[PDB]
Symmetry: D2
Subunit: 330 residues, 4 copies
């Protein structure tokens, strides 16, 4: 009959609330509850059979690697149940883009996985959450959503969990992808215009089932006058890979290169990403000799997605050439 969709709540704005309606700021993060939430969008009942669970109650900006492994596992066990057709995950928008890419890489299932958040507090005037949630259930419950990877359904759009990023603050169309949306959801109905071209879910070489721990990976920012300080400090603190958020085409200040070649020698992966995030990508051997130094380029991945790919890739290889290949297919 209808599909069986499970909602995993993890906190959010969605189920947040401010002092009021005119107040689309200052709101408290992860304020309500899953059963409470489902109960407020009774239309859901027309799309599918929905069950909800509260996995964690967090603010996405304070998320942890463990919260990620915990959510990763939980979805795996649900994906295996003969009586779960699709999964919607409620999440804070700050780090939605990281979780989404995390799940796209390690969830070896065909079943639609949908992450949704909201830009305005639920009690805010014209709050976006209702409709986003309605549409997330709409997509998780359609047989055509099967096999397209992790999906994000905000603002009437179907975005790929791999490359959508929080790019516009305050506004409802905050989530954008440099490669565009895969489709649109209008009145709970799905319209597809494009398909993913990168490895994910069912065709991924990674399995959450095989991950017990995630390695420590950190990010340093490049700008005029930057020094090697933040990089050596994160390495000294445990960073197993450093994501270099360079200016331009992943460029490294001349005052830092030496730091980076030494860190490399002492076994730290060096991944060149950039703070030029609306389009294009970082090219290998263009601004730095990646072959000579044994560094890796993050391709089109922004600093935070690149972090997600590396922590996961490093769960299986410590070979620069292998990581390069991986940044090139996922």
């Amino acid at each position: 009959k209808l599909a069986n969709v499970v909602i995993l709540a993890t906190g959010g704005t969605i189920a947040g609330a401010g002092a009021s309606a005119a107040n689309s700021a200052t709101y408290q993060a992860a304020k309500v509850g899953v059963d409470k939430l489902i109960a407020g969008v009774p239309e859901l009942a027309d799309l599918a059979n929905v069950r909800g669970e509260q996995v964690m109650q967090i603010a996405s900006e304070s998320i942890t690697n463990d919260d990620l492994l915990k959510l990763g596992k939980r979805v795996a066990e649900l994906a295996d149940s003969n009586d779960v057709d699709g999964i919607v995950i409620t999440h804070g928008t700050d780090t939605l883009e990281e979780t989404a890419y995390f799940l796209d890489l390690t969830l070896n299932t065909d079943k639609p996985i949908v992450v949704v958040g909201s830009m305005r507090p639920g009690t805010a005037m014209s709050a976006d959450g209702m409709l986003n949630l309605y549409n997330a259930v709409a997509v998780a419950s359609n047989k055509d959503s099967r096999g397209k990877g992790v999906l994000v359904t905000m603002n009437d759009e179907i975005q790929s969990g791999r490359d959508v990023s929080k790019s516009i603050n305050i506004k409802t169309e905050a989530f954008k992808s440099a490669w565009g949306p895969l489709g649109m959801v209008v009145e709970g109905k799905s319209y597809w215009f494009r398909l993913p071209a990168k490895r994910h879910t069912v065709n991924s070489e990674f399995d959450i089932k095989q991950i017990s721990s995630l390695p420590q990976v950190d990010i340093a920012y490049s700008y005029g006058n930057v020094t090697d300080t933040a990089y050596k400090a994160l390495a000294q603190n445990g960073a197993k890979a450093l994501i270099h958020a360079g200016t331009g085409n992943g460029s490294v200040s001349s005052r830092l290169t030496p730091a980076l070649q030494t860190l490399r020698k002492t076994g730290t992966q060096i991944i060149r990403s950039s703070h030029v995030n609306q389009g294009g990508f970082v090219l290998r051997n263009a601004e730095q000799p990646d072959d000579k130094n044994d560094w890796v380029v993050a391709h089109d991945l922004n600093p935070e997605k690149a972090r997600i790919l590396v922590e996961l890739a490093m769960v299986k290889t410590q070979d620069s050439k292998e990581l390069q290949r991986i940044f090139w297919e996922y």
Copy 2:
């Protein structure tokens, strides 16, 4: 007559690839301001052109001293009766930081245009020749006076305030969240909008009174972040920290305590974000700015907020004033 335009060369516009089909991989900043004016003889149809090699740097490696040196030379030129507009050729990586710096400290109404190129000169369909020709067309036009520092790339007139390097590889790399001020076509300028923020002649900042810039650093926020870069940068003498937060300059709760402490010990805390295509960080929204005595960088991305703060701190350390500054420039 004809405007007297001066090109200040600082060192891709000056880069050469190994080939014609090498539209990357190149050595940037290898050619002379003189061979640059001479490669484009049509310049002479717009104005009286003279150039100077102020420095030869790779922009991803610029330092505060190179900024102060370019800012003083520009001021000296702008004061001259014999200079109508100025053009600065610069590498694109940090062109956005230099363009805003100049907009804040050059109290002059003469046009200052900063231009670069996405492809090296030796490349097929190299964008540089037109960029320069247009930078000179804009600098030479009386209409350009008084609009702040301008960036003329990809046929557009952008504000040096909020234009940013947003797209890699493409010739349309430079965008602004509030759009272009106009376009430049066949050496003619077309205007559609005017700047609303304080700049140049209306700036309370003056290069002539700046002898040094305070050290300001940027720390990035992401899932599982720690206070490690924050503490280290400060320990290394950062006088203010730009926090490149997630969402509306949000702060990881395992980091808040270190920020409170740094603040207490005198480091300015400026909340910015890595949500840069549009929107802004709102005071007291994700964090009690009033209570912790922090500042919000408004719509400015992290490298821009650092530029405004180094310069604001040359005159004040009052976080109330730094906040008014973030709201007007």
Copy 3:
């Protein structure tokens, strides 16, 4: 104390009610139309003293040139009153860009005129009209909105009435300008980032006070294999000016320049616009010899917006050279 804002409804209700906002005796006793609109969003009262008036009852895709005139004339009367500090006009989104433009050119006033609409029906889940109307009022009552021209406040933005256009179907962010937003409006507060550089309201040479009738102006679309049929039918049915929605930089098919030249001769003004509407503009003498044939280029103006500038310019002149000048200053 509070500014005085008048809301002029031109169609159906753009927003729904709320909590007690709807149950309240106030709401309940409120006479349908614009009175239930104001009563539903009680937070309005905290921005200004608001009053509504239903000036017309139209579907925006069916607006006529007499409807423009009437709204235009009523705005001028209101602006003139000492008792009116600002005006909000609720309007259908289909031709909102057309009215917004017309009011910018003919209302010689510095009091804020704000046009606002809604992409989702007042009854939909996550309906945007409520917050849009709350922000229109917030903008109409800020002394900082004065002398900025007609404003449109949708999707938390402050768009210029001149070049804002409905560019995306469905989405709440439908309205875009090639030159960007002027600012944003969040939690009732205004944030400005750009100023208009073109003529409008107070510096306009046109005045509704003085316009009694508008000239007939029509639009003809160009594409592969177009013929002169529609150009010739529109002129024969009374068009005084033809807006050519051309391909590229207002290019004209060689099979059509003949009809154009002859209509020109028999007095029809020929305005070369284009169907390339996300940016750039039409250059005089580039695709056609405008000088020789005595045609006008619509500069960056889309077809419907160029129709608006011409109906007006032609209230005052029929000189091709003057029209050109006006296309370049407004």
Copy 4:
């Protein structure tokens, strides 16, 4: 084993030339094929290239007969053992219309790339050289087969189906609401997305069975519009009319009557819109299409909806089949 690429020239600015290097206007396009290939000598490291001049037209004046001729020539080469890929140089005004036509009726998986220039080859920083290089690099690659007709301008690989000339003047003129499929940098292709709609080898339409195309015309909608253009076009023989409505393909109530009646009389009524940067037109939203027996153009702009209808009309006159096609291609 170099791939074999055939370059078909049809005219337009890539082959253009003005009277000066400064001018990106007023120039004579479709002025110069051997000239084309000799000028980018590096093409030879990509593939074995041969060219032929098929027509020499100005794209804004193209006829349906020009489309069948081209479409027919492409099928003949696509069939030859000797052709691995095809590049077509075309003026940019109606390039989005020929790319889409070809996407629909060329039953082949061999790469078909349509390319143009925003600047004449005489201009400074002229875009055609690299564009051309890039077209041959994409047409030569194994990876391009089976993706539909592609457009390679501005370093992007755009889908021939929804790419549209959206920006005037600029080298970035060509955009799609659903984004680029990838990019080509240094003759190499990077793919980020795949087509989801029927095209080429999976289209039910075939240029070999098309010997003629139905007349299809477009009428524009705005405030105060009348039934005049609708009626004059139908009288003159349009078999389908594309309505470019305001909003969600909205119809003025003063026009509904001419439409219902034209429908009665046998013309197809396809509701498109002039809201072209995104979204689509919904069936039964603004008009009772079910009752009126009309069709909705989905996300297709006026000019694309016309290509699809004239083509669907070679197979069916059934409104419901037509609707289906509008939903799959």
